Amino acid sequence: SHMTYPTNLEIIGGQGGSSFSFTGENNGASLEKIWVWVGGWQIKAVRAWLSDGRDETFGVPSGSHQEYVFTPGECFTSLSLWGNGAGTRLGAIKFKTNKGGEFFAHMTSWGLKTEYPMDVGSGYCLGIVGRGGSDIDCMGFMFLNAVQSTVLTNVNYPTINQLIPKVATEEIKSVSFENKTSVKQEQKVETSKKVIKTSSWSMTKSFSSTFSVEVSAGIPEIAEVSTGFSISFGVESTHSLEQTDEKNETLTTTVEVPPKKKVDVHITIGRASFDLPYTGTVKITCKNGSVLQYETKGQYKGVAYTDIKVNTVEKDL
Amino acid sequence: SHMTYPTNLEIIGGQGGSSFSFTGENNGASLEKIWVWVGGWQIKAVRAWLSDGRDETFGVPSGSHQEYVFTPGECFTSLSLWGNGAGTRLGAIKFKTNKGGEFFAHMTSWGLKTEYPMDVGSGYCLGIVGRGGSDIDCMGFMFLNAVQSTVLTNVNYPTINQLIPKVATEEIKSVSFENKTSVKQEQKVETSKKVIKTSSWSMTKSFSSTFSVEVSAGIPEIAEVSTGFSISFGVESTHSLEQTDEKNETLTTTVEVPPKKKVDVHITIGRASFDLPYTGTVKITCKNGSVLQYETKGQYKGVAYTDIKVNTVEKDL
Ligand SMILES: OC[C@H]1O[C@H](O[C@H]2[C@@H](O)[C@H](O)[C@@H](CO)O[C@@H]2O)[C@@H](O)[C@@H](O)[C@@H]1O
Ligand SMILES: OC[C@H]1O[C@H](O[C@H]2[C@@H](O)[C@H](O)[C@@H](CO)O[C@@H]2O)[C@@H](O)[C@@H](O)[C@@H]1O
Ligand SMILES: [Cl-]
Ligand SMILES: [Cl-]
């Protein structure tokens, strides 16, 4: 049998110190900044920040540090690690990024020996894992493996049943008919109106800049019933994380004009702006068949419309 | 027995003066600005500007004018005209728009008699038609009737075969493998890369703000061939006027690593941004079955990508 994993991690160095694990495996967070302190025959310490705000130091800093700051969407293209030649510490880190950056931090006295080039997977670095004490005994960088799909699913809007939506009226057209005869009359009125419907689900920028996130979700919809407006949780379908859809809404109406009456026809549409929290599950499927999933929450913003409405008012003359 | 038309025009007033027709039915231009001069027993004159820059005056101005300036997307919601009550001149114009505006210009001495409320169709005003001399003898506002669909089709890119595409390399990943044994080795490498493809076809903003324009067109594509970068006119399909499609592009590669050899693998993708002219036909189908079409020209802008490329280099160590 053959085992695959959604992350790629190759740890280099010795067996001393105490284990550490500092990664976004739980929530999709990525490595956002790293400080590296070197010594004569080791990497001395590493401080790392993840995109979710976590910040931890391993080993004991001495001297000044080298820094690398990753921008959202910046991924590794390559990584090599060296031990210290004696098999007892990490000795050097070298990487390059898809934004043209390079970084090289190495011990200062002892010469570098065997280079270990790594497969960065997708290039999205989830953090670092190794062992430290006084120094960095060993370390590796964890990557998400190449991705087949990244999907936001199991979406809920937990406040949707409490929400009272503000629905603004857009006038489309009004016209007046006059029936001076003693028999009812029929008038056809055709209406068209462009509507622009939008949906967006917020996501940490690092993740959404690196991966094309598809959304499997119902969205909020708006309708006008007898008792007023009603919000509903629509049927689940596929969306992009930010989605806009234009269409020409149309309607054909037959207006009845009673004898000796004026009828005014008022044709309108209601526009609603949703701004409410959502929860869901991010499901990553790797090319190698493995999966990584985690729960998330953010803000849904949406613009939705009612059906075109026709109201008629009758008057004399 | 029954004729329908893509335009709706009801002329009110008398039979004197000379005929005029000032409308965008040739090119989809709309009424952008109107000045109206009134007199005691008539509308005296009207000056009109269409969205394509045309500007004409009908009748002979006297005194100050009233103005209405339409913004892109602003459509009529209602319109009423009055004669001067004697059947010899236009007497008043009243309209309301979908941005909440209202305008009422009327003769100043004689009182208004019969109101003629009009059906504004889609609300998109193409211009004015009537008869003028000293005064406005008669006039009507021409509207596009309610729309079923509006499509940009028959799209060509007249320069596409002359264009030399500027393709930027984006690095995805590099890794090295070593084979110290005297027997063949294989290494599987999987790659994923987010690509964001875009297409946009420029259009006069008054039209595209009012109508949901679908595009039935092929789009420029880019490929890597033996000599260099081959552009091509892709297969026809449906798009929106500004479109974005993101995807995780992926590839699995089996790398052969010979005995006593080092193989470096360099994985890239090419991104090109097209900027070139297009021609096509705007076809409007009204709800009543009629059609208005006209030829148009604009600028297409597109971002497109090559396939993921794998470059393999053999070293000896
Ligand atoms: O990270 C290196 C090393 O750090 C700690 O050991 C330190 C010290 O306490 C020891 O006396 C000496 C000798 O071995 O070395 C270090 O300075 C420990 O955490 C150790 O496990 C670790 O390898
Ligand atoms: O637009 C009104 C009227 O204008 C012109 O006629 C003017 C003038 O030339 C005539 O002498 C007098 C009297 O008949 O009326 C106007 O002042 C013409 O273009 C006419 O056809 C038009 O109705
Ligand atoms: Cl070593
Ligand atoms: Cl009249």
mmCIF file of C-alpha atoms in Angstrom, chain A residues 35-204:
data_model
loop_
_atom_site.group_PDB
_atom_site.id
_atom_site.type_symbol
_atom_site.label_atom_id
_atom_site.label_comp_id
_atom_site.label_asym_id
_atom_site.label_seq_id
_atom_site.Cartn_x
_atom_site.Cartn_y
_atom_site.Cartn_z
ATOM 1 C CA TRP A 35 13.974 35.973 11.741
ATOM 2 C CA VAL A 36 17.112 33.807 11.755
ATOM 3 C CA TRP A 37 20.053 34.105 14.180
ATOM 4 C CA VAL A 38 23.213 32.295 13.206
ATOM 5 C CA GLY A 39 26.230 31.127 15.120
ATOM 6 C CA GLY A 40 29.627 29.703 14.241
ATOM 7 C CA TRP A 41 28.590 26.062 13.938
ATOM 8 C CA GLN A 42 24.823 26.220 14.005
ATOM 9 C CA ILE A 43 21.686 28.081 13.387
ATOM 10 C CA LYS A 44 21.163 29.648 16.804
ATOM 11 C CA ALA A 45 17.458 30.560 16.757
ATOM 12 C CA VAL A 46 14.438 31.152 14.544
ATOM 13 C CA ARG A 47 11.446 33.394 15.276
ATOM 14 C CA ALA A 48 8.428 32.846 13.054
ATOM 15 C CA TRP A 49 5.146 34.629 12.541
ATOM 16 C CA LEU A 50 2.117 32.951 10.948
ATOM 17 C CA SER A 51 -0.578 34.846 8.985
ATOM 18 C CA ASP A 52 -3.079 34.305 11.860
ATOM 19 C CA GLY A 53 -0.964 36.439 14.246
ATOM 20 C CA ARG A 54 0.869 33.623 16.111
ATOM 21 C CA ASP A 55 4.532 34.408 16.913
ATOM 22 C CA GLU A 56 7.020 31.977 18.475
ATOM 23 C CA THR A 57 10.808 31.773 18.981
ATOM 24 C CA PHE A 58 12.807 28.532 19.009
ATOM 25 C CA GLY A 59 16.403 28.311 20.221
ATOM 26 C CA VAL A 60 18.099 31.217 21.957
ATOM 27 C CA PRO A 61 18.865 34.333 19.898
ATOM 28 C CA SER A 62 22.354 35.800 19.949
ATOM 29 C CA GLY A 63 23.489 38.728 17.790
ATOM 30 C CA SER A 64 21.504 40.366 15.013
ATOM 31 C CA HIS A 65 19.009 38.503 12.900
ATOM 32 C CA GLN A 66 18.343 38.167 9.209
ATOM 33 C CA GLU A 67 14.681 38.692 8.172
ATOM 34 C CA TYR A 68 12.382 37.546 5.458
ATOM 35 C CA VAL A 69 8.877 39.070 5.196
ATOM 36 C CA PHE A 70 6.437 37.237 2.911
ATOM 37 C CA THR A 71 3.616 39.168 1.182
ATOM 38 C CA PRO A 72 0.243 37.536 0.559
ATOM 39 C CA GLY A 73 0.412 35.189 -2.380
ATOM 40 C CA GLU A 74 4.231 34.930 -2.132
ATOM 41 C CA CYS A 75 5.203 31.249 -2.277
ATOM 42 C CA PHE A 76 8.525 29.427 -2.113
ATOM 43 C CA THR A 77 9.904 28.241 -5.437
ATOM 44 C CA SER A 78 12.866 26.429 -3.925
ATOM 45 C CA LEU A 79 14.397 25.578 -0.538
ATOM 46 C CA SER A 80 17.665 23.974 0.492
ATOM 47 C CA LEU A 81 18.771 23.121 3.980
ATOM 48 C CA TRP A 82 22.212 22.171 5.346
ATOM 49 C CA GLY A 83 23.175 20.567 8.606
ATOM 50 C CA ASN A 84 26.323 21.748 10.368
ATOM 51 C CA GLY A 85 28.380 18.912 8.827
ATOM 52 C CA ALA A 86 28.548 17.060 12.185
ATOM 53 C CA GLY A 87 24.902 15.951 12.141
ATOM 54 C CA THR A 88 24.164 17.828 15.366
ATOM 55 C CA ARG A 89 22.574 21.148 14.338
ATOM 56 C CA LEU A 90 20.909 22.921 11.463
ATOM 57 C CA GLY A 91 23.636 24.861 9.629
ATOM 58 C CA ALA A 92 21.942 26.837 6.843
ATOM 59 C CA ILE A 93 18.692 27.824 5.133
ATOM 60 C CA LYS A 94 18.398 28.935 1.504
ATOM 61 C CA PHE A 95 15.169 29.741 -0.338
ATOM 62 C CA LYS A 96 13.734 31.640 -3.302
ATOM 63 C CA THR A 97 10.214 32.924 -3.847
ATOM 64 C CA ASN A 98 7.775 33.390 -6.708
ATOM 65 C CA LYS A 99 8.177 37.168 -6.285
ATOM 66 C CA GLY A 100 11.894 37.032 -7.096
ATOM 67 C CA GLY A 101 13.165 37.051 -3.479
ATOM 68 C CA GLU A 102 16.048 35.030 -2.149
ATOM 69 C CA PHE A 103 17.215 34.414 1.400
ATOM 70 C CA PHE A 104 20.397 32.700 2.668
ATOM 71 C CA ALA A 105 21.270 32.355 6.358
ATOM 72 C CA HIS A 106 24.219 30.159 7.380
ATOM 73 C CA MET A 107 26.579 29.383 10.217
ATOM 74 C CA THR A 108 29.650 31.636 10.124
ATOM 75 C CA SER A 109 32.722 29.515 11.019
ATOM 76 C CA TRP A 110 32.278 25.912 9.935
ATOM 77 C CA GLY A 111 32.027 25.206 6.188
ATOM 78 C CA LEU A 112 28.782 23.979 4.608
ATOM 79 C CA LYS A 113 28.834 20.342 3.424
ATOM 80 C CA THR A 114 25.866 18.335 2.031
ATOM 81 C CA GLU A 115 23.046 20.455 0.571
ATOM 82 C CA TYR A 116 19.517 19.026 0.892
ATOM 83 C CA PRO A 117 17.221 20.488 -1.805
ATOM 84 C CA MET A 118 13.548 20.228 -0.942
ATOM 85 C CA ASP A 119 10.312 19.863 -2.902
ATOM 86 C CA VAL A 120 8.190 22.830 -1.844
ATOM 87 C CA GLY A 121 4.937 21.211 -3.009
ATOM 88 C CA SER A 122 2.455 23.967 -3.859
ATOM 89 C CA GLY A 123 4.993 26.484 -2.451
ATOM 90 C CA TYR A 124 2.582 27.496 0.313
ATOM 91 C CA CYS A 125 4.525 27.218 3.533
ATOM 92 C CA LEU A 126 2.461 26.325 6.599
ATOM 93 C CA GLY A 127 5.273 26.885 9.098
ATOM 94 C CA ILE A 128 8.191 25.120 10.737
ATOM 95 C CA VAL A 129 8.808 21.943 12.743
ATOM 96 C CA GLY A 130 11.906 20.686 14.500
ATOM 97 C CA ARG A 131 13.756 20.605 17.776
ATOM 98 C CA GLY A 132 15.465 23.361 19.722
ATOM 99 C CA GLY A 133 17.232 24.051 23.013
ATOM 100 C CA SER A 134 20.072 26.531 23.126
ATOM 101 C CA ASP A 135 20.245 26.275 19.346
ATOM 102 C CA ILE A 136 18.259 24.873 16.453
ATOM 103 C CA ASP A 137 19.036 21.164 16.683
ATOM 104 C CA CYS A 138 16.960 20.407 13.639
ATOM 105 C CA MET A 139 14.282 21.991 11.493
ATOM 106 C CA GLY A 140 12.215 21.680 8.369
ATOM 107 C CA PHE A 141 9.666 23.862 6.603
ATOM 108 C CA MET A 142 6.215 22.348 6.117
ATOM 109 C CA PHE A 143 4.527 22.886 2.752
ATOM 110 C CA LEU A 144 1.066 22.117 1.482
ATOM 111 C CA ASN A 145 1.502 19.585 -1.350
ATOM 112 C CA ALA A 146 0.398 20.523 -4.890
ATOM 113 C CA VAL A 147 -3.360 21.206 -4.844
ATOM 114 C CA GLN A 148 -6.080 19.708 -7.123
ATOM 115 C CA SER A 149 -8.912 21.778 -5.597
ATOM 116 C CA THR A 150 -9.611 24.168 -2.728
ATOM 117 C CA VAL A 151 -13.300 24.476 -1.828
ATOM 118 C CA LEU A 152 -15.259 26.392 0.785
ATOM 119 C CA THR A 153 -18.234 24.200 1.675
ATOM 120 C CA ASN A 154 -20.732 23.448 4.464
ATOM 121 C CA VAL A 155 -21.533 27.157 4.554
ATOM 122 C CA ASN A 156 -24.009 28.447 7.137
ATOM 123 C CA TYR A 157 -25.259 31.940 7.972
ATOM 124 C CA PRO A 158 -26.133 31.602 11.659
ATOM 125 C CA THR A 159 -27.864 35.029 11.949
ATOM 126 C CA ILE A 160 -29.898 34.751 8.714
ATOM 127 C CA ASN A 161 -33.210 33.859 10.462
ATOM 128 C CA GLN A 162 -33.008 36.932 12.716
ATOM 129 C CA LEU A 163 -32.047 39.440 10.066
ATOM 130 C CA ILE A 164 -34.471 42.175 8.999
ATOM 131 C CA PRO A 165 -33.222 43.341 5.617
ATOM 132 C CA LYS A 166 -33.230 46.927 4.407
ATOM 133 C CA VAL A 167 -34.739 46.669 0.893
ATOM 134 C CA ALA A 168 -34.430 49.774 -1.264
ATOM 135 C CA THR A 169 -36.892 50.469 -4.066
ATOM 136 C CA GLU A 170 -35.657 51.065 -7.583
ATOM 137 C CA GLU A 171 -38.294 52.607 -9.859
ATOM 138 C CA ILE A 172 -38.420 51.073 -13.267
ATOM 139 C CA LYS A 173 -41.383 52.671 -15.010
ATOM 140 C CA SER A 174 -44.764 54.268 -14.482
ATOM 141 C CA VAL A 175 -47.490 54.872 -17.058
ATOM 142 C CA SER A 176 -51.119 55.950 -16.926
ATOM 143 C CA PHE A 177 -54.052 54.683 -18.992
ATOM 144 C CA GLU A 178 -57.529 56.183 -19.332
ATOM 145 C CA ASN A 179 -60.767 54.337 -20.092
ATOM 146 C CA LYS A 180 -63.566 56.779 -20.877
ATOM 147 C CA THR A 181 -65.912 54.019 -22.137
ATOM 148 C CA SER A 182 -68.425 51.906 -20.207
ATOM 149 C CA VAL A 183 -66.477 48.692 -20.963
ATOM 150 C CA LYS A 184 -63.202 47.401 -19.498
ATOM 151 C CA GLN A 185 -60.022 47.632 -21.650
ATOM 152 C CA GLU A 186 -56.691 45.691 -21.759
ATOM 153 C CA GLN A 187 -53.143 47.170 -22.055
ATOM 154 C CA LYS A 188 -49.922 45.215 -22.428
ATOM 155 C CA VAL A 189 -46.850 46.625 -20.652
ATOM 156 C CA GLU A 190 -43.383 45.136 -21.118
ATOM 157 C CA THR A 191 -40.582 45.844 -18.652
ATOM 158 C CA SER A 192 -36.828 45.273 -18.628
ATOM 159 C CA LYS A 193 -34.307 46.093 -15.918
ATOM 160 C CA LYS A 194 -30.605 45.267 -15.521
ATOM 161 C CA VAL A 195 -29.833 43.806 -12.114
ATOM 162 C CA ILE A 196 -26.318 43.181 -10.795
ATOM 163 C CA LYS A 197 -26.262 40.448 -8.144
ATOM 164 C CA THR A 198 -23.113 39.988 -6.035
ATOM 165 C CA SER A 199 -21.711 37.515 -3.527
ATOM 166 C CA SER A 200 -18.461 37.476 -1.605
ATOM 167 C CA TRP A 201 -17.114 35.405 1.270
ATOM 168 C CA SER A 202 -14.138 36.929 3.115
ATOM 169 C CA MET A 203 -11.009 34.814 3.453
ATOM 170 C CA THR A 204 -7.504 35.349 4.770
#
